[PDB]
Amino acid sequence: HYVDWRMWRDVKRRKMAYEYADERLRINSLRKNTILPKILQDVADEEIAALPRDSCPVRIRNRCVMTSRPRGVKRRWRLSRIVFRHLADHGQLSGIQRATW
Amino acid sequence: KQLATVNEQPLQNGFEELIQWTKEGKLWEFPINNEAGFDDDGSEFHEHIFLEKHLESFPKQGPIRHFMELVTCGLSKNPYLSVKQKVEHIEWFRNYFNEKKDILKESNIQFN
Amino acid sequence: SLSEYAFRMSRLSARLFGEVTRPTNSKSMKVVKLFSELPLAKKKETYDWYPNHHTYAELMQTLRFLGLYRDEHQDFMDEQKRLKKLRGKEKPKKGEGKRA
Amino acid sequence: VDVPKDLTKPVVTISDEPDILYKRLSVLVKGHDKAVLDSYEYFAVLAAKELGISIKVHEPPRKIERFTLLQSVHIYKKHRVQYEMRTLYRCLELEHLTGSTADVYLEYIQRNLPEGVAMEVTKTQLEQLPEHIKEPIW
Amino acid sequence: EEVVIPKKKTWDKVAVLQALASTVNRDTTAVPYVFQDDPYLMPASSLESRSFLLAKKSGENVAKFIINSYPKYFQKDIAEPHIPCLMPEYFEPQIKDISE
Amino acid sequence: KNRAARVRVSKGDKPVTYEEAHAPHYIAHRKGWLSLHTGNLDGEDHAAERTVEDVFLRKFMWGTFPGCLADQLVLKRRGNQLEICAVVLRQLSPHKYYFLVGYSETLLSYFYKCPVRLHLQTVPSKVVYKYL
Amino acid sequence: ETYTEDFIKKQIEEFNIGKRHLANMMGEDPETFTQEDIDRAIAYLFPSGLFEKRARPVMKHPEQIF
Amino acid sequence: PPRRKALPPRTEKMAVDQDWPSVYPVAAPFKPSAVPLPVRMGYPVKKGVPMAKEGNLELLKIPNFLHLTPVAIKKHCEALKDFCTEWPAALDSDEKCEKHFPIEIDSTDYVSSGPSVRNPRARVVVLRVKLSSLNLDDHAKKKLIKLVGERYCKTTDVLTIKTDRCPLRRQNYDYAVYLLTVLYHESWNTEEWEKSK
Ligand SMILES: [Mg+2]
Numbered sequence: 001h002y003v004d005w006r007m008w009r010d011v012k013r014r015k016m017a018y019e020y021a022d023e024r025l026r027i028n029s030l031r032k033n034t035i036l037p038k039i040l041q042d043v044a045d046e047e048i049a050a051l052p053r054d055s056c057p058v059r060i061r062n063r064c065v066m067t068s069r070p071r072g073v074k075r076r077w078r079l080s081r082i083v084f085r086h087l088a089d090h091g092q093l094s095g096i097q098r099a100t101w
Numbered sequence: 102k103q104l105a106t107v108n109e110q111p112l113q114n115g116f117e118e119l120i121q122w123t124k125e126g127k128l129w130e131f132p133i134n135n136e137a138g139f140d141d142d143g144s145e146f147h148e149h150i151f152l153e154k155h156l157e158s159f160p161k162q163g164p165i166r167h168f169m170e171l172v173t174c175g176l177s178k179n180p181y182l183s184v185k186q187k188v189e190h191i192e193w194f195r196n197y198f199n200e201k202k203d204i205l206k207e208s209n210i211q212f213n
Numbered sequence: 214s215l216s217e218y219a220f221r222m223s224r225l226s227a228r229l230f231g232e233v234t235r236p237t238n239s240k241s242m243k244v245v246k247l248f249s250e251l252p253l254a255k256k257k258e259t260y261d262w263y264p265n266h267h268t269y270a271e272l273m274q275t276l277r278f279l280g281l282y283r284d285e286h287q288d289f290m291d292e293q294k295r296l297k298k299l300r301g302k303e304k305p306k307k308g309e310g311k312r313a
Numbered sequence: 314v315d316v317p318k319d320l321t322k323p324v325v326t327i328s329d330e331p332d333i334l335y336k337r338l339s340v341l342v343k344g345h346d347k348a349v350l351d352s353y354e355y356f357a358v359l360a361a362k363e364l365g366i367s368i369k370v371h372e373p374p375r376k377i378e379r380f381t382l383l384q385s386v387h388i389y390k391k392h393r394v395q396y397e398m399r400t401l402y403r404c405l406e407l408e409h410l411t412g413s414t415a416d417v418y419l420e421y422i423q424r425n426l427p428e429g430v431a432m433e434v435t436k437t438q439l440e441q442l443p444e445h446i447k448e449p450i451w
Numbered sequence: 452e453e454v455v456i457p458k459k460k461t462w463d464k465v466a467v468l469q470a471l472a473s474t475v476n477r478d479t480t481a482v483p484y485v486f487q488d489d490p491y492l493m494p495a496s497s498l499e500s501r502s503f504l505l506a507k508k509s510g511e512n513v514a515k516f517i518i519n520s521y522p523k524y525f526q527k528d529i530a531e532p533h534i535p536c537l538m539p540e541y542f543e544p545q546i547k548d549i550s551e
Numbered sequence: 552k553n554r555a556a557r558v559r560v561s562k563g564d565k566p567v568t569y570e571e572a573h574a575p576h577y578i579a580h581r582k583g584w585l586s587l588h589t590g591n592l593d594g595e596d597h598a599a600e601r602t603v604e605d606v607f608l609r610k611f612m613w614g615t616f617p618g619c620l621a622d623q624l625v626l627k628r629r630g631n632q633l634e635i636c637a638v639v640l641r642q643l644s645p646h647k648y649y650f651l652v653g654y655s656e657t658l659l660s661y662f663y664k665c666p667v668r669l670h671l672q673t674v675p676s677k678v679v680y681k682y683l
Numbered sequence: 684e685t686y687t688e689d690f691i692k693k694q695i696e697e698f699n700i701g702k703r704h705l706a707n708m709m710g711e712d713p714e715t716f717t718q719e720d721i722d723r724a725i726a727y728l729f730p731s732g733l734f735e736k737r738a739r740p741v742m743k744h745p746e747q748i749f
Numbered sequence: 750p751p752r753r754k755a756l757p758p759r760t761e762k763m764a765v766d767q768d769w770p771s772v773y774p775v776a777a778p779f780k781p782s783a784v785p786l787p788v789r790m791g792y793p794v795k796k797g798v799p800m801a802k803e804g805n806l807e808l809l810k811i812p813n814f815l816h817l818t819p820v821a822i823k824k825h826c827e828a829l830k831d832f833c834t835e836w837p838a839a840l841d842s843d844e845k846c847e848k849h850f851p852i853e854i855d856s857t858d859y860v861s862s863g864p865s866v867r868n869p870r871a872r873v874v875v876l877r878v879k880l881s882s883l884n885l886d887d888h889a890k891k892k893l894i895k896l897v898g899e900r901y902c903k904t905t906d907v908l909t910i911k912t913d914r915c916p917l918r919r920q921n922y923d924y925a926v927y928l929l930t931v932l933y934h935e936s937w938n939t940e941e942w943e944k945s946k
């Protein structure tokens with residue numbers, strides 16, 4: 001019942017990324033230092049590379065929660081510029097007015 | 102329950118409705134406390150900040166000690182994790198290094 | 214570029230305030246930053262970015278079948294779908310389609 | 314004529330523990346509307362005067378956050394719609410309060426905080442030196 | 452010199468609300484608070500008074516029936532502090548083993 | 552020409568309410584906001600979740616009271632409380648109104664986990680500000 | 684909308700009666716309540732921040748309104 | 750029968766000397782049938798007047814103060830005096846407060862609207878104490894000022910310790926007090942390496 005299949009793929013990515021966040025954080029710490037032996041750090045490089053692709057946080061996209069637009073989204077409201085303006089221009093967003101100066 | 106019914110009457114005014122909600126736990130209790138109902142397992146401040154007790158199983162000296170000292174320093178500065186979550190991080194490292202002892206021995210690092 | 218006194222006093226304050234005590238380069242200082250905050254994937258804004266569209270869509274569909282919610286939109290596409298059957302533009306059977 | 318003969322007053326029990334001492338309470342309130350902050354200040358000041366609290370009011374400078382958006386759904390980059398959010402402030406500074414007095418006053422004014430108005434209460438608490446610091450152990 | 456600190460006063464969470472309620476008396480011009488304060492909706496007879504409350508109770512019962520019939524839709528807990536009373540009720544036995 | 556939320560002049564026979572008669576450049580000059588919360592204040596959090604709740608509530612109330620609403624909702628939030636103020640018509644029987652008030656207040660309190668109140672104001676007919 | 688003289692007369696009676704309640708609400712003397720106190724009371728009771736003052740809540744004598 | 754007719758507004762039964770706080774005891778939306786004021790609102794059309802109060806959505810949008818009239822406020826505070834305690838008369842001025850209570854703890858509470866009361870900014874605790882109120886000799890004072898760093902302000906001679914490590918405010922308060930303790934005792938301790946100054 002999500003807006004489209006693209007939103008649905010991002011919903012699964014956000015869920016998988018959450019499930020693997022701790023495991024990924026622990027393995028990365030082993031890699032992001034010069035203290036541990038390079039042999040151990042090389043095994044960690046393979047381990048984090050073998051985790052499912054959709055667990056990588058960089059693959060998450062901030063899409064509009066109402067229309068699924070991947071660009072023109074305001075992060076504070078999570079709305080596309082077209083959807084935000086529709087609500088703001090109707091006086092339905094508390095405290096947001098047209099700017100004139 | 103029958104004794105509650107005999108004293109039961111409809112809400113008489115706005116204040117009474119607020120009182121009923123407060124007693125039921127629906128309405129917030131004032132003055133507003135931002136930590137109302139949240140206790141981190143009654144953990145003391147020393148539990149969060151001092152985490153070296155958990156590093157006893159690890160080697161007293163060496164690269165692993167230095168690395169784990171950095172891990173605990175970050176965990177001690179984390180206000181978003183409970184004490185239980187912080188111990189989980191350290192425990193995972195105890196297991197990980199136990200599995201990689203062969204590699205650590207090749208690097209002249211003695212673990213346990 | 215520090216005196217022995219200044220260096221040992223800076224190391225004492227670091228122990229007192231819970232900072233890194235051993236000499237650590239900027240690269241390895243990332244381990245401290247990694248564990249001092251929540252991972253981006255663990256933040257509420259990230260994994261709770263979308264509203265649960267399943268709950269909203271399914272709830273309001275149930276309330277419509279119960280007679281308590283009037284869905285003007287769903288009524289509009291039920292009348293259109295109803296007129297397309299009388300016109301012959303009905304959805305075909307899956308598998309037993311025009312092609313084969 | 315139909316007046317309650319007697320009224321059950323809420324029970325307030327004096328404890329055996331010393332009360333907290335507040336040097337200052339800084340009740341900062343934010344709002345999009347200035348007139349609402351004017352009415353709230355009149356309320357909160359009048360409430361303090363009736364309870365014997367010492368209150369001083371000042372108005373911090375307002376903050377306006379502006380941002381721009383595209384006006385059309387497609388192309389036409391030269392044409393923009395600009396929106397703003399105005400945040401007005403009013404700082405209510407109480408002085409020389411006690412833990413009990415602060416609890417009552419804060420509850421009273423927080424419960425009457427009008428919709429669209431936020432609050433940030435900075436409570437300075439007077440404290441005494443810890444027993445350990447009274448003298449060195451070495 | 453010694454300073455005497457006043458003894459703390461402790462009251463119940465509802466004491467302040469109760470103190471404010473004692474100040475107000477019944478408004479003689481208004482119908483009971485339970486009813487909607489609107490000329491069209493205000494009850495205009497002893498029978499309407501009863502029926503209007505019964506209709507409101509029926510509405511509450513219908514909602515409760517739906518809430519318990521479909522708990523999945525009302526399981527997203529966003530309240531802090533948690534409110535146990537606003538959660539769905541589960542009336543079916545969850546232990547299927549035949550034992551004491 | 553600008554289009555956003557502008558009811559366009561006709562032959563002088565289209566009744567418009569006071570809200571519908573004012574274009575977006577009056578939202579802080581002649582008309583107010585239909586929702587009041589703190590999310591959009593400086594340094595405040597959770598503006599996104601407050602917006603999704605407002606959008607849902609306006610749709611829920613439109614379908615729950617079909618043909619009864621005479622104007623837009625006024626959503627009010629004070630602390631934990633949520634207050635919905637609706638101007639409705641005097642066509643539906645009072646019994647049905649009381650049923651829908653008790654039903655919507657209960658169903659929404661369990662959905663958003665907060666005490667919700669619905670304050671209905673009845674009007675004989677839609678209040679016409681002008682004829683466009 | 685045409686306002687006949689009888690309608691205006693009923694509006695004046697409404698203002699005089701409403702004027703007494705407003706004095707009772709604010710705890711002032713109904714007999715010395717002036718138009719400048721009415722404006723101050725309405726501004727407090729119905730706080731409006733609308734930039735245009737002609738859009739704000741008003742309680743004036745019908746002779747000055749109509 | 751004919752359609753249900755709405756009763757006349759109950760403002761017609763209200764006396765000009767009624768107890769208004771009883772009509773609006775708590776915060777409630779503006780009800781034109783309950784407020785006996787001919788208040789008008791709305792930008793008037795040409796040769797028009799502001800809209801009446803009935804069905805006026807602008808008045809419904811205002812957060813009114815009808816429940817907080819000067820009469821109600823004075824009556825409310827009279828019932829709330831029993832809950833208050835008396836400020837110690839000895840602590841007349843701020844200088845007297847500093848002498849008897851040298852330490853000051855600042856905390857903040859945030860009141861916002863919504864279903865969740867949680868705010869991550871409320872955990873922060875700030876402890877301020879003037880080094881002149883502490884029993885510090887010459888050596889101890891110099892060592893302390895070096896250990897704290899920028900936490901000490903020479904102009905005001907105030908040591909500010911901000912703590913936000915722990916989830917809760919009580920834990921950050923206990924940590925702020927603990928840091929002051931170890932700083933005081935550690936400053937007094939004289940190490941052999943201090944001779945290399
Ligand atoms: Mg990207």
Ligand SMILES: [Mg+2]
Nearest residue numbers: 384392552553
């Ligand atoms: Mg243009």
